[PDB]
Structure 1
Amino acid sequence: RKIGIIGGTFDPPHYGHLLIANEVYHALNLEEVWFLPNQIPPHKQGRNITSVESRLQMLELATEAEEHFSICLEELSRKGPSYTYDTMLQLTKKYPDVQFHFIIGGDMVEYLPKWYNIEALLDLVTFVGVARPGYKLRTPYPITTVEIPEFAVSSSLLRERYKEKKTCKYLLPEKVQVYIERNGLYE
């Protein structure tokens, strides 16, 4: 019934993603959270980038130990560039029984008005914003706030670190780390 949705390139997946998923899953009492991998946008595309194959494997190794965490390949499967609205439009139909909670960073709530079909989107899913404790998102949109201790880690940051041969311990699952060294990613 109540399913959370976390989008991203998950290149690579990390503890920040798991923490956010877990906090929201409990704070709002969802039955499960789906990680919705986004395809690497055209302007970032090029060789030397991670294959979809690898990202999905890291994501599975990252969500392996959690039965209430799943991977929703719906956006990555469909043709190419999908506005968030379209993806959610297609999911609502395939699962009319589910009330999706789209999870985003509080930093993003400031740009929702620039999101494609944002108006209609709000009719398809319930937005959940993430904010540091002691803060609430004040916005004209009906958005749900969930306070979560800040963990300044991102896929971008991790790729940069693996390039500088810098330590990434405690930043992401050890399974993902092994996989990264084994296949020499971001090297």
Structure 2
Amino acid sequence: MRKIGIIGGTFDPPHYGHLLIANEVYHALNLEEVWFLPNQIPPHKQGRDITSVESRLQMLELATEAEEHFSICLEELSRKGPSYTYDTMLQLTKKYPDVQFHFIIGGDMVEYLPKWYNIEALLDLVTFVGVARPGYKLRTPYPITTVEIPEFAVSSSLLRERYKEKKTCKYLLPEKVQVYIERNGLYE
């Protein structure tokens, strides 16, 4: 099953920018499917806070369950420590020898690439697909694939701020995710 997309994330919370870039890359590159890959500990944001894996997982399920071309990969949640993508992609490449993985990143992560653990070796394990994001730019010296989408400036940190400040989040993320955030008072 050759062409598979994988979107790595903290998903804190998941939102329409995640679903948008996943669906757009899926159509653009004729992928068989897209795997959402939630991290246990974000390797670049190790000191911080972040909501439980359990609530992040539940949001992600809510966010993606409608979608049959979407599924959740738990490889990192079954590992201790910071979730380095090179380690994960090593495991998945050997578990799935007949898949060409396309790792999907937004503009801000394309810029941060030079600081990823084992970046140069990672680029040989996987095909990176960068997608534009307002305020970031897709220019990178690394040989990545690029897909054009209708850019959406929603972020997880913006959503967290707005929930705290009691500001509207309508049209920013799935209604099912909104329902769960408000029920459990995450981000207030």
TM-score normalised over the length of structure 1: 0.90
* Residue deviations 1:136-169 (CA, integer Å, cap 9, x gap): 8444322100011111111111011000000100
**Corresponding position: 1:99 with 2:100:** yes
* Residue deviations 1:58-88 (CA, integer Å, cap 9, x gap): 1001101101101111012112113211110
Residues of 1 paired with 2:24 and 2:128: CA distance? 15
Residues of 2 paired with 1:133 and 1:164: CA distance? 23
Contact 1:132/1:148 (8 A) holds in 2 = no
- C-alpha root-mean-square deviation of aligned residues, in Å? 2.7
* Distance 1:135-1:171 versus aligned 2 partners, 3 A rule: closer
Identity %: 99
* Distance 1:43-1:69 versus aligned 2 partners, 3 A rule: closer
* Distance 1:169-1:134 versus aligned 2 partners, 3 A rule: closer
User: In terms of mean alpha carbon deviation, does 128-137 or 63-72 score higher?
Assistant: 128-137
User: In terms of mean alpha carbon deviation, does 132-141 or 92-101 score higher?
Assistant: 132-141
* Distance 1:134-1:54 versus aligned 2 partners, 3 A rule: closer
How many aligned positions are there? 187
How far residue 8 of structure 1 moved from its aligned partner, in angstroms, is 1.2
Contact 1:6/1:104 (8 A) holds in 2 = yes
Contact 1:133/1:147 (8 A) holds in 2 = no
Structure 2, unaligned runs of 5 or more:
none
* Distance 1:105-1:68 versus aligned 2 partners, 3 A rule: same
* Distance 1:41-1:19 versus aligned 2 partners, 3 A rule: closer
* Distance 1:134-1:178 versus aligned 2 partners, 3 A rule: closer
Match of 1:65 in 2: 66
Residues of 2 paired with 1:135 and 1:58: CA distance? 26
* Distance 1:169-1:142 versus aligned 2 partners, 3 A rule: same
Contact 2:106/2:133 (8 A) holds in 1 = no
How far residue 184 of structure 1 moved from its aligned partner, in angstroms, is 1.4
* Residue deviations 1:31-65 (CA, integer Å, cap 9, x gap): 11111112344896799842211111110011011
* Distance 1:76-1:127 versus aligned 2 partners, 3 A rule: same
* Distance 1:47-1:81 versus aligned 2 partners, 3 A rule: closer
Contact 2:130/2:146 (8 A) holds in 1 = yes
